[PDB]
Amino acid sequence: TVDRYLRQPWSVVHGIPMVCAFAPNWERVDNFQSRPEDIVVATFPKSGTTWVSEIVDMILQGGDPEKCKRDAIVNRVPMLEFAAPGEMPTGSEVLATMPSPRVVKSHLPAHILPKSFWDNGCKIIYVGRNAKDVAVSFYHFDLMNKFEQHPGTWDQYLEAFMAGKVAYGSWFDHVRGYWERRQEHPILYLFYEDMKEDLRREITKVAQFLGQELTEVALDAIAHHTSFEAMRDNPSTNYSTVPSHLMDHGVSPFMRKGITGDWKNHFTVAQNAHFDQYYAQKMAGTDLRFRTE
């Protein structure tokens, strides 16, 4: 019954391209009832959502791995806007029966994140990643995720990505939006590259933002269980339990490569030069900066 929604071109909601299966009955997102205690993990897709979600859930468990093994991260951290009409309950429905503090995954741009989150002052942890690696990760993600419009070739996908036509829209608007919205809201704004550089440093910042104290032992336990290699091999976090007819894990696994700089293995010389010129124009007039190396 969900099949008619899969592998369809993007729908649109509030002017933002949307996963086809997610777009119907969008009032469930507009009118989502948040709780003041909700923790929002917000990202442009493929920017480290799963990685930070597992860290957050681990902090809430005091660093105990086994409370995070009992269920897959897609059930422990539902995505707000997820829907699979006729096969699965929506993310919003699932969240209503979760005890507090709810950890809420979402990829919505800040200006269409449900206004309840802003009015309850919910803590938001945003994760940004450099646009080149995001493009690469999101291309391979769409090759394997049947919810997505098929991306065709990489060169055509990169063009769509730069023009903000992919699901959830313009990367440039997405990352700048949450960067500026911290002026009126508590937002911890993390960078994927900083987490590659020094993961324990970034865990400590997440912990302080959530008001949690971590012993030295728990910090090491969290870092040990959120390494790329650990999360790739963990069935609870590597999405290998998602059914085959929704994600073709053989095309590309979710825990694909987990590095910074895989763009160098995908951008052609020409694509790289054209991207850099366009990026520099788009990112002028913001102090927000990312690292590609």
Ligand SMILES: Nc1ncnc2c1ncn2[C@@H]1O[C@H](COP(=O)(O)O)[C@@H](OP(=O)(O)O)[C@H]1O
């Ligand atoms: N512990 C970890 N360390 C590093 N990268 C991780 C990671 N867990 C997930 N990732 C990477 O995060 C990306 C997925 O992002 P999201 O969780 O927002 O969907 C993928 O990037 P790659 O496709 O470049 O490998 C995935 O490999």
Ligand SMILES: Oc1ccccc1Br
């Ligand atoms: O399920 C998805 C669809 C599109 C982008 C990210 C995710 Br996660």
